[PDB]
Amino acid sequence: FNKITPNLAEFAFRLYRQLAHQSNSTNIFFSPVSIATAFAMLSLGTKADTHDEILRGLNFNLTEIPEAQIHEGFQELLRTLNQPDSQLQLTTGNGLFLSEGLKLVDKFLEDVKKLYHSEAFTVNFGDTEEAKKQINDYVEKGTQGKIVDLVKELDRDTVFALVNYIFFKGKWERPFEVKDTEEEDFHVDQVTTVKVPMMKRLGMFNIQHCKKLSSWVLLMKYLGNATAIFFLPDEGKLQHLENRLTHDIITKFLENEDRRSASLHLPKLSITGTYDLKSVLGQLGITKVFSNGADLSGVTEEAPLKLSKAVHKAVLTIDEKGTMFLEAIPMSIPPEVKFNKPFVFLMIEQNTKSPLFMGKVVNPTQK
């Protein structure tokens, strides 16, 4: 091992804190892993400063970690996420759309399909409306209709577009009962509430109040190789929570094997996040691959090339089952832990400890 996990975690937090500062009003949900994998794969077609800018933007110190170890970590991670036995029910995809007039390098197309198990297509960008249709049809087919009309605009000068999508519908190892789901208040702020569907269950949870984070920290395992970590900040401590989050704090939580009783209230969630990666990753220092000076000679040898379009959409559903453990609950008052106010969450792949998803819910029904 998990050599690149600390870098992915730092990239995840840099990405989250930028999105959180740009809008303090919207639900956030994105996949650090899928974004970093897409651009680690893209770097194979870049050289020199364009290449170095991408790997540094993904929080890799190129003077300390060899590039071979970087790609080994991503391919090893893509391995655990894409195996036929996975109960994770995780559908991710990366589509590369290149102008049909370009002479493509076979090494790049081979590395993209073989090493990173991604898809590359040629498209007539002279027909902008038909190019957008083929791109959106690919994403809609890849998500069985979950993501429709991903791309809304394409510039006329587009010759290279990247789409990265990921859809997650997890199944809890210890599920909620549908009969127990009821409408409850969600405190969008200290004086305002909205009604949301709220799951609840009495059980033995990996849960604790953390004075360091001023938050309740709930960990719940999915069927498969992933764990959801929910952070419920104390009154007025949301910003304090986001500032303190580090990878080492996450690791300590994952190692805890203690369970305690609690009456958990957790909202049903169906949230999405759509991000312009050119704008977003440009704030993280990745700019040259999107500019006219881009060194994409690994993709096409003769003609100039730049990445004109890059979009990420992540979709999350949280419900009671997602599709027979008996827990012993003591005769004692369990704390009432209600996720009925803005909270942060992370999904962690258990093998690599990599951050599959990161997000914040400010309002479950603001769809």
Swiss-Prot record:
It is found in: Secreted; Endoplasmic reticulum. Glycans are attached at residues 24, 61, 225. Changing residue 134 to E: In L-Frankfurt. Changing residue 331 to V: Oxidation-resistant inhibitor of therapeutic importance. Keywords: Acute phase, Blood coagulation, Endoplasmic reticulum, Extracellular matrix, Glycoprotein, Hemostasis, Phosphoprotein, Protease inhibitor, Secreted, Serine protease inhibitor, Signal. SMART domains: SERPIN. GO terms for molecular function: identical protein binding; protease binding; serine-type endopeptidase inhibitor activity. Changing residue 126 to W: In M2-Obernburg. The modification S-cysteinyl cysteine is found at residue 210. GO terms for biological process: acute-phase response; blood coagulation. Its main location: secreted. The record marks 331-332 as: Reactive bond. Changing residue 336 to K: In Christchurch. Residues 322-341 are annotated as: RCL. Pfam families: Serpin. The record marks 306-309 as: (Microbial infection) Cleavage. One of its GO terms (cellular component) is platelet alpha granule lumen. InterPro entries: Serpin_CS, Serpin_dom, Serpin_fam, Serpin_sf, Serpin_sf_1, Serpin_sf_2. Ubiquitous. Expressed in leukocytes and plasma. The reactive center loop (RCL) extends out from the body of the protein and directs binding to the target protease. The protease cleaves the serpin at the reactive site within the RCL, establishing a covalent linkage between the carboxyl group of the serpin reactive site and the serine hydroxyl of the protease. The resulting inactive serpin-protease complex is highly stable. It is linked to Alpha-1-antitrypsin deficiency: A disorder whose most common manifestation is emphysema, which becomes evident by the third to fourth decade. A less common manifestation of the deficiency is liver disease, which occurs in children and adults, and may result in cirrhosis and liver failure. Environmental factors, particularly cigarette smoking, greatly increase the risk of emphysema at an earlier age. Belongs to the serpin family. Interacts with CELA2A. Interacts with ERGIC3 and LMAN1/ERGIC53. Interacts with PRSS1/trypsin. Interacts with PRSS1/Trypsin. The variants S and Z interact with CANX and PDIA3. The aberrant form is found in the plasma of chronic smokers, and persists after smoking is ceased. It can still be found ten years after smoking has ceased. PANTHER family: ALPHA-1-ANTITRYPSIN, SERINE PROTEASE INHIBITOR, SERPIN. This is Alpha-1-antitrypsin. It comes from Homo sapiens.
